[PDB]
Structure 1
Amino acid sequence: VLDGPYQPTTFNPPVDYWMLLAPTAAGVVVEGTNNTDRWLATILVEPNVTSETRSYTLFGTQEQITIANASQTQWKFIDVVKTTQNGSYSQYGPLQSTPKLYAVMKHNGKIYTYNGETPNVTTKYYSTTNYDSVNMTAFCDFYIIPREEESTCTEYINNGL
């Protein structure tokens, strides 16, 4: 019944569907923009990292970002966001994860991602103009899950495939 895995690509996902991402290596997991007031890129950070500046390619250009992960044993998924073309990148609420899975959804004028610490995750959102036409670039294999089945996606985030 599980819909995937799909290979890395750029496409325009339907609204009200979770794109469940299964990265294997540290680094950029997925990116999305409306080209006007919202840019979002999720970075997967290794367990146990003291504050350091790193370089990432985001939307095809090199960017310097200060990263940390206080967890000894858990991964850290960080959404790096800007709200204008030339604006600086900011970080908001992470997901600390054992299973190494993440998800993103276009819903109700916003982009939603998962949040908190496995195995007790929640969701968070970012208001996004023209939310429905946002193209997403996946840099790893992914699956597609309807919002109606959100509880299944939440189980995967919490517990793995």
Structure 2
Amino acid sequence: LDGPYQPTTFNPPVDYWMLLAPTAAGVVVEGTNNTDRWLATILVEPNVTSETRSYTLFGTQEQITIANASQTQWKFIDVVKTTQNGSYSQYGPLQSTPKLYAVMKHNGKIYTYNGETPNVTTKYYSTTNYDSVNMTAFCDFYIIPREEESTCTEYINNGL
């Protein structure tokens, strides 16, 4: 843990975990190149019978769909596009009980925690122009070295 860095747009380094500690549902962070690669990160509030609300994606107003089956568990949803206002696939299911998110990029593959909290699963996403992609935090986050990988995992499970 480095420090609760407020939301802002900048170039996210590598080999470092990005512990995002949001306060409520909604958008948490996003990142794209605005050329041929988009990757956003949003959170869904518990109890949701599949709804579709209108939100601003990278400045462009769009409609997103969310859902939830738990009562006190959040459901993180990661979206990705190929072109400007093109496709829109919402993947990357991650349930958090203690409320905590973390993301990282190494070896060109975005390492993010998946699955449920008590049983998270750090998967990876093959990339190419990752080094040429910017991110925009929508809340407070913390910086942590990849060396403490095991630390990040335990943090999401029942850290806070």
The offset of 1:38, in angstroms, is 2.0
The offset of 1:37, in angstroms, is 3.0
Matched, 1:142 2:144: no
Contact 2:76/2:93, CA 8 A, preserved across alignment:
yes
The offset of 1:85, in angstroms, is 2.0
Give the SS at the match of 1:6.
Answer: coil
The offset of 1:118, in angstroms, is 1.0
* Distance across 2 between alignment mates of 1:112 and 1:42: 14
Structure 1 moving runs of 4+ over 4 Å:
none
Q: 1:129 to 1:35 in 2, by over 3 A?
A: farther
Residues 50-100 of structure 1 show CA distances to partners (whole Å, capped at 9, x for unaligned) of 111111111011110121112222110110111222322111131011111
What's the TM-score once normalised by structure 1's chain length?
0.92
Identity of aligned residues (%): 100
* Unaligned 5+ runs, structure 1: none
Q: When the two structures are aligned, how many residues end up with a matched partner?
A: 160
Give the root-mean-square deviation of aligned CA atoms.
1.4
The offset of 1:147, in angstroms, is 1.1
The offset of 1:12, in angstroms, is 1.1
What's the TM-score once normalised by structure 2's chain length?
0.92
* Distance across 1 between alignment mates of 2:85 and 2:126: 18
Give the SS at the match of 2:4.
Answer: strand
